[PDB]
PDB file of C-alpha atoms in Angstrom:
ATOM      1  CA  UNK H 991      14.133   6.133  26.048  1.00  0.00           C
ATOM      2  CA  UNK H 992      14.586   7.182  22.364  1.00  0.00           C
ATOM      3  CA  UNK H 993      16.349   9.592  19.960  1.00  0.00           C
ATOM      4  CA  UNK H 994      19.517  11.455  20.967  1.00  0.00           C
ATOM      5  CA  UNK H 995      20.682  14.624  19.211  1.00  0.00           C
ATOM      6  CA  UNK H 996      24.455  14.813  19.707  1.00  0.00           C
ATOM      7  CA  UNK H 997      26.032  18.198  19.130  1.00  0.00           C
ATOM      8  CA  UNK H 998      29.443  19.781  19.557  1.00  0.00           C
ATOM      9  CA  UNK H 999      30.213  23.531  19.228  1.00  0.00           C
ATOM     10  CA  UNK H1000      33.893  24.346  18.621  1.00  0.00           C
ATOM     11  CA  UNK H1001      36.751  26.547  17.513  1.00  0.00           C
ATOM     12  CA  UNK H1002      39.812  25.236  15.690  1.00  0.00           C
ATOM     13  CA  UNK H1003      43.457  26.349  16.211  1.00  0.00           C
ATOM     14  CA  UNK H1004      43.588  27.108  12.459  1.00  0.00           C
ATOM     15  CA  UNK H1005      43.189  30.540  10.941  1.00  0.00           C
ATOM     16  CA  UNK H1006      39.707  31.528   9.770  1.00  0.00           C
ATOM     17  CA  UNK H1007      38.984  30.696   6.097  1.00  0.00           C
ATOM     18  CA  UNK H1008      42.246  28.702   5.775  1.00  0.00           C
ATOM     19  CA  UNK H1009      42.788  25.440   3.884  1.00  0.00           C
ATOM     20  CA  UNK H1010      43.584  23.709   7.201  1.00  0.00           C
ATOM     21  CA  UNK H1011      40.129  24.775   8.452  1.00  0.00           C
ATOM     22  CA  UNK H1012      38.485  23.608   5.171  1.00  0.00           C
ATOM     23  CA  UNK H1013      40.304  20.251   5.321  1.00  0.00           C
ATOM     24  CA  UNK H1014      39.256  19.554   8.946  1.00  0.00           C
ATOM     25  CA  UNK H1015      35.582  20.232   8.060  1.00  0.00           C
ATOM     26  CA  UNK H1016      35.648  18.296   4.717  1.00  0.00           C
ATOM     27  CA  UNK H1017      37.424  15.278   6.288  1.00  0.00           C
ATOM     28  CA  UNK H1018      35.235  15.244   9.452  1.00  0.00           C
ATOM     29  CA  UNK H1019      32.105  15.115   7.266  1.00  0.00           C
ATOM     30  CA  UNK H1020      33.448  12.232   5.094  1.00  0.00           C
ATOM     31  CA  UNK H1021      34.627  10.160   8.086  1.00  0.00           C
ATOM     32  CA  UNK H1022      31.850  10.727  10.629  1.00  0.00           C
ATOM     33  CA  UNK H1023      28.814  10.652   8.306  1.00  0.00           C
ATOM     34  CA  UNK H1024      29.910   7.170   7.029  1.00  0.00           C
ATOM     35  CA  UNK H1025      29.724   5.545  10.495  1.00  0.00           C
ATOM     36  CA  UNK H1026      26.712   3.176  10.937  1.00  0.00           C
ATOM     37  CA  UNK H1027      23.983   4.692  13.127  1.00  0.00           C
ATOM     38  CA  UNK H1028      24.925   8.338  12.347  1.00  0.00           C
ATOM     39  CA  UNK H1029      21.871  10.142  10.918  1.00  0.00           C
ATOM     40  CA  UNK H1030      21.322  13.739   9.773  1.00  0.00           C
ATOM     41  CA  UNK H1031      24.975  14.716  10.195  1.00  0.00           C
ATOM     42  CA  UNK H1032      25.156  18.519   9.739  1.00  0.00           C
ATOM     43  CA  UNK H1033      28.060  20.962   9.730  1.00  0.00           C
ATOM     44  CA  UNK H1034      27.156  24.388  11.002  1.00  0.00           C
ATOM     45  CA  UNK H1035      28.595  27.855  11.432  1.00  0.00           C
ATOM     46  CA  UNK H1036      27.895  29.251  14.963  1.00  0.00           C
ATOM     47  CA  UNK H1037      26.673  32.872  14.555  1.00  0.00           C
ATOM     48  CA  UNK H1038      25.792  34.282  18.016  1.00  0.00           C
ATOM     49  CA  UNK H1039      28.370  36.953  18.993  1.00  0.00           C
ATOM     50  CA  UNK H1040      27.873  36.203  22.736  1.00  0.00           C
ATOM     51  CA  UNK H1041      29.610  32.732  22.736  1.00  0.00           C
ATOM     52  CA  UNK H1042      33.161  32.339  21.229  1.00  0.00           C
ATOM     53  CA  UNK H1043      32.719  29.145  19.137  1.00  0.00           C
ATOM     54  CA  UNK H1044      32.883  29.236  15.332  1.00  0.00           C
ATOM     55  CA  UNK H1045      31.352  25.928  14.251  1.00  0.00           C
ATOM     56  CA  UNK H1046      29.131  23.076  15.208  1.00  0.00           C
ATOM     57  CA  UNK H1047      28.464  19.456  14.288  1.00  0.00           C
ATOM     58  CA  UNK H1048      24.990  18.009  14.879  1.00  0.00           C
ATOM     59  CA  UNK H1049      23.756  14.438  14.350  1.00  0.00           C
ATOM     60  CA  UNK H1050      21.060  12.084  15.635  1.00  0.00           C
ATOM     61  CA  UNK H1051      21.138   8.515  16.961  1.00  0.00           C
ATOM     62  CA  UNK H1052      18.150   6.174  17.313  1.00  0.00           C
ATOM     63  CA  UNK H1053      19.144   5.449  20.952  1.00  0.00           C
ATOM     64  CA  UNK H1054      22.002   5.494  23.472  1.00  0.00           C
ATOM     65  CA  UNK H1055      23.277   2.083  22.137  1.00  0.00           C
ATOM     66  CA  UNK H1056      23.799   3.634  18.656  1.00  0.00           C
ATOM     67  CA  UNK H1057      25.490   6.674  20.246  1.00  0.00           C
ATOM     68  CA  UNK H1058      27.917   4.501  22.242  1.00  0.00           C
ATOM     69  CA  UNK H1059      28.633   2.338  19.130  1.00  0.00           C
ATOM     70  CA  UNK H1060      29.478   5.506  17.135  1.00  0.00           C
ATOM     71  CA  UNK H1061      31.769   6.761  19.953  1.00  0.00           C
ATOM     72  CA  UNK H1062      33.626   3.420  20.109  1.00  0.00           C
ATOM     73  CA  UNK H1063      33.820   2.878  16.323  1.00  0.00           C
ATOM     74  CA  UNK H1064      37.491   2.667  15.190  1.00  0.00           C
ATOM     75  CA  UNK H1065      36.962   5.492  12.656  1.00  0.00           C
ATOM     76  CA  UNK H1066      35.606   7.805  15.390  1.00  0.00           C
ATOM     77  CA  UNK H1067      38.395   6.812  17.820  1.00  0.00           C
ATOM     78  CA  UNK H1068      41.030   7.539  15.107  1.00  0.00           C
ATOM     79  CA  UNK H1069      39.370  10.841  14.168  1.00  0.00           C
ATOM     80  CA  UNK H1070      39.361  12.045  17.795  1.00  0.00           C
ATOM     81  CA  UNK H1071      42.983  11.033  18.385  1.00  0.00           C
ATOM     82  CA  UNK H1072      44.438  12.204  15.073  1.00  0.00           C
ATOM     83  CA  UNK H1073      42.303  15.223  14.127  1.00  0.00           C
ATOM     84  CA  UNK H1074      40.114  16.483  16.972  1.00  0.00           C
ATOM     85  CA  UNK H1075      42.615  16.519  19.858  1.00  0.00           C
ATOM     86  CA  UNK H1076      45.463  18.135  17.796  1.00  0.00           C
ATOM     87  CA  UNK H1077      43.355  20.689  15.831  1.00  0.00           C
ATOM     88  CA  UNK H1078      40.502  21.782  18.118  1.00  0.00           C
ATOM     89  CA  UNK H1079      41.211  24.815  20.363  1.00  0.00           C
ATOM     90  CA  UNK H1080      38.072  24.507  22.498  1.00  0.00           C
ATOM     91  CA  UNK H1081      34.623  22.943  22.494  1.00  0.00           C
ATOM     92  CA  UNK H1082      31.374  22.174  24.321  1.00  0.00           C
ATOM     93  CA  UNK H1083      29.354  18.985  23.893  1.00  0.00           C
ATOM     94  CA  UNK H1084      25.570  19.521  24.173  1.00  0.00           C
ATOM     95  CA  UNK H1085      23.407  16.376  23.791  1.00  0.00           C
ATOM     96  CA  UNK H1086      19.649  16.369  23.739  1.00  0.00           C
ATOM     97  CA  UNK H1087      16.632  14.145  24.008  1.00  0.00           C
ATOM     98  CA  UNK H1088      13.007  15.242  23.438  1.00  0.00           C
ATOM     99  CA  UNK H1089      11.351  16.609  26.596  1.00  0.00           C
ATOM    100  CA  UNK H1090       8.983  14.007  28.101  1.00  0.00           C
TER     101      UNK H1090
ATOM    102  CA  UNK S1004      21.955  34.037   3.478  1.00  0.00           C
ATOM    103  CA  UNK S1005      19.220  31.565   4.613  1.00  0.00           C
ATOM    104  CA  UNK S1006      17.896  29.430   7.508  1.00  0.00           C
ATOM    105  CA  UNK S1007      18.866  30.145  11.123  1.00  0.00           C
ATOM    106  CA  UNK S1008      18.594  27.533  13.878  1.00  0.00           C
ATOM    107  CA  UNK S1009      18.194  29.446  17.149  1.00  0.00           C
ATOM    108  CA  UNK S1010      18.924  27.499  20.304  1.00  0.00           C
ATOM    109  CA  UNK S1011      19.212  28.220  24.007  1.00  0.00           C
ATOM    110  CA  UNK S1012      20.519  25.766  26.658  1.00  0.00           C
ATOM    111  CA  UNK S1013      19.502  26.610  30.240  1.00  0.00           C
ATOM    112  CA  UNK S1014      18.914  25.824  33.884  1.00  0.00           C
ATOM    113  CA  UNK S1015      16.010  27.233  35.883  1.00  0.00           C
ATOM    114  CA  UNK S1016      16.098  28.447  39.531  1.00  0.00           C
ATOM    115  CA  UNK S1017      13.246  25.991  40.243  1.00  0.00           C
ATOM    116  CA  UNK S1018      13.679  22.580  41.798  1.00  0.00           C
ATOM    117  CA  UNK S1019      13.994  19.618  39.432  1.00  0.00           C
ATOM    118  CA  UNK S1020      10.662  17.923  38.575  1.00  0.00           C
ATOM    119  CA  UNK S1021       8.658  20.702  40.304  1.00  0.00           C
ATOM    120  CA  UNK S1022       5.384  22.260  39.141  1.00  0.00           C
ATOM    121  CA  UNK S1023       7.184  25.610  38.724  1.00  0.00           C
ATOM    122  CA  UNK S1024       9.582  23.885  36.293  1.00  0.00           C
ATOM    123  CA  UNK S1025       6.647  22.198  34.458  1.00  0.00           C
ATOM    124  CA  UNK S1026       4.747  25.505  34.219  1.00  0.00           C
ATOM    125  CA  UNK S1027       7.743  27.416  32.769  1.00  0.00           C
ATOM    126  CA  UNK S1028       8.199  24.732  30.061  1.00  0.00           C
ATOM    127  CA  UNK S1029       4.435  24.363  29.273  1.00  0.00           C
ATOM    128  CA  UNK S1030       3.911  28.162  29.100  1.00  0.00           C
ATOM    129  CA  UNK S1031       7.105  28.822  27.059  1.00  0.00           C
ATOM    130  CA  UNK S1032       5.946  26.279  24.454  1.00  0.00           C
ATOM    131  CA  UNK S1033       2.418  27.799  24.185  1.00  0.00           C
ATOM    132  CA  UNK S1034       3.690  31.399  23.931  1.00  0.00           C
ATOM    133  CA  UNK S1035       6.783  31.030  21.741  1.00  0.00           C
ATOM    134  CA  UNK S1036       5.513  28.420  19.252  1.00  0.00           C
ATOM    135  CA  UNK S1037       2.519  30.720  18.410  1.00  0.00           C
ATOM    136  CA  UNK S1038       4.733  33.608  17.209  1.00  0.00           C
ATOM    137  CA  UNK S1039       4.715  34.089  13.382  1.00  0.00           C
ATOM    138  CA  UNK S1040       7.946  32.886  11.754  1.00  0.00           C
ATOM    139  CA  UNK S1041       8.781  30.348  14.519  1.00  0.00           C
ATOM    140  CA  UNK S1042       9.160  26.876  12.960  1.00  0.00           C
ATOM    141  CA  UNK S1043      10.023  23.475  14.456  1.00  0.00           C
ATOM    142  CA  UNK S1044       9.961  24.736  18.045  1.00  0.00           C
ATOM    143  CA  UNK S1045      11.329  21.898  20.231  1.00  0.00           C
ATOM    144  CA  UNK S1046      11.776  21.543  23.983  1.00  0.00           C
ATOM    145  CA  UNK S1047      14.691  19.372  24.958  1.00  0.00           C
ATOM    146  CA  UNK S1048      16.348  17.834  27.986  1.00  0.00           C
ATOM    147  CA  UNK S1049      20.169  18.382  27.942  1.00  0.00           C
ATOM    148  CA  UNK S1050      21.830  15.035  28.841  1.00  0.00           C
ATOM    149  CA  UNK S1051      25.643  15.453  28.655  1.00  0.00           C
ATOM    150  CA  UNK S1052      27.111  15.303  32.198  1.00  0.00           C
ATOM    151  CA  UNK S1053      30.049  17.574  31.182  1.00  0.00           C
ATOM    152  CA  UNK S1054      27.988  20.844  30.820  1.00  0.00           C
ATOM    153  CA  UNK S1055      25.668  22.004  33.703  1.00  0.00           C
ATOM    154  CA  UNK S1056      22.492  22.942  31.752  1.00  0.00           C
ATOM    155  CA  UNK S1057      19.271  20.947  32.142  1.00  0.00           C
ATOM    156  CA  UNK S1058      17.160  21.985  29.155  1.00  0.00           C
ATOM    157  CA  UNK S1059      17.159  23.452  25.715  1.00  0.00           C
ATOM    158  CA  UNK S1060      14.829  25.203  23.287  1.00  0.00           C
ATOM    159  CA  UNK S1061      15.484  24.894  19.547  1.00  0.00           C
ATOM    160  CA  UNK S1062      13.645  26.550  16.643  1.00  0.00           C
ATOM    161  CA  UNK S1063      14.272  27.614  13.047  1.00  0.00           C
ATOM    162  CA  UNK S1064      13.690  30.869  11.157  1.00  0.00           C
ATOM    163  CA  UNK S1065      13.602  31.293   7.370  1.00  0.00           C
ATOM    164  CA  UNK S1066      16.104  34.197   7.636  1.00  0.00           C
ATOM    165  CA  UNK S1067      17.571  36.848   9.947  1.00  0.00           C
ATOM    166  CA  UNK S1068      14.518  39.151   9.297  1.00  0.00           C
ATOM    167  CA  UNK S1069      12.176  36.465  10.744  1.00  0.00           C
ATOM    168  CA  UNK S1070      14.553  35.960  13.698  1.00  0.00           C
ATOM    169  CA  UNK S1071      14.631  39.694  14.501  1.00  0.00           C
ATOM    170  CA  UNK S1072      10.798  39.915  14.131  1.00  0.00           C
ATOM    171  CA  UNK S1073      10.401  37.027  16.626  1.00  0.00           C
ATOM    172  CA  UNK S1074      12.829  38.712  19.081  1.00  0.00           C
ATOM    173  CA  UNK S1075      10.934  42.030  18.881  1.00  0.00           C
ATOM    174  CA  UNK S1076       7.422  40.505  18.962  1.00  0.00           C
ATOM    175  CA  UNK S1077       5.476  41.790  22.022  1.00  0.00           C
ATOM    176  CA  UNK S1078       4.792  38.209  23.200  1.00  0.00           C
ATOM    177  CA  UNK S1079       8.530  37.380  23.127  1.00  0.00           C
ATOM    178  CA  UNK S1080       9.446  40.683  24.836  1.00  0.00           C
ATOM    179  CA  UNK S1081       6.855  39.983  27.599  1.00  0.00           C
ATOM    180  CA  UNK S1082       8.022  36.373  27.986  1.00  0.00           C
ATOM    181  CA  UNK S1083      11.666  37.436  28.421  1.00  0.00           C
ATOM    182  CA  UNK S1084      10.814  40.174  30.924  1.00  0.00           C
ATOM    183  CA  UNK S1085       8.210  38.286  32.952  1.00  0.00           C
ATOM    184  CA  UNK S1086       9.351  34.648  32.788  1.00  0.00           C
ATOM    185  CA  UNK S1087      12.886  34.227  31.447  1.00  0.00           C
ATOM    186  CA  UNK S1088      14.745  36.908  33.432  1.00  0.00           C
ATOM    187  CA  UNK S1089      13.074  36.025  36.808  1.00  0.00           C
ATOM    188  CA  UNK S1090      13.125  32.190  36.475  1.00  0.00           C
ATOM    189  CA  UNK S1091      16.268  31.278  34.513  1.00  0.00           C
ATOM    190  CA  UNK S1092      19.434  30.660  36.597  1.00  0.00           C
ATOM    191  CA  UNK S1093      21.855  30.520  33.660  1.00  0.00           C
ATOM    192  CA  UNK S1094      21.945  29.990  29.912  1.00  0.00           C
ATOM    193  CA  UNK S1095      23.914  29.962  26.655  1.00  0.00           C
ATOM    194  CA  UNK S1096      22.531  31.030  23.281  1.00  0.00           C
ATOM    195  CA  UNK S1097      23.936  29.011  20.342  1.00  0.00           C
ATOM    196  CA  UNK S1098      22.647  30.005  16.869  1.00  0.00           C
ATOM    197  CA  UNK S1099      23.507  28.205  13.683  1.00  0.00           C
ATOM    198  CA  UNK S1100      23.411  28.490   9.937  1.00  0.00           C
ATOM    199  CA  UNK S1101      24.322  25.701   7.474  1.00  0.00           C
ATOM    200  CA  UNK S1102      28.044  25.622   6.625  1.00  0.00           C
ATOM    201  CA  UNK S1103      28.661  27.133   3.164  1.00  0.00           C
TER     202      UNK S1103
END
């Protein structure tokens, strides 16, 4: 079936430009980009005024197997439990594959 | 300020797998990818079951000037008036710049 582009757009509970915000972004990058199968991990600022999300993470997986293996990796599980759930205010997951 | 990744996630009023759906996608690609400043135009299928959008378009602009010039291009204006507004059920625009 092929390549999957996994993305998440989000807003944190932390104040804009704070050290808490910086630390979430810096730590997420270090942790998530190190997981086997994660490719082209990018941190983004969301700039459209129409939707109320401040940031995004984007990455690509060779296939659904790699995506599932990332999701279930202990480092990802720990990150979601210990950082994402407590610090993220709101989010949308948007995953893509090439049209076909 | 730099590169802008312009994306739109959407659902059409047309039935899934129909010729009307095919034609919207085929024509959007031909029209939009030909506009000066549009780079890496990609048509995508949205696959997360959590959000109710079927497709996405993604493209990149060198800067905000190129983005604005695409938006205001007669071909884009005509496409939005004649195809997007009448055929799109719902959508979200999510634009990104590199964090940073």
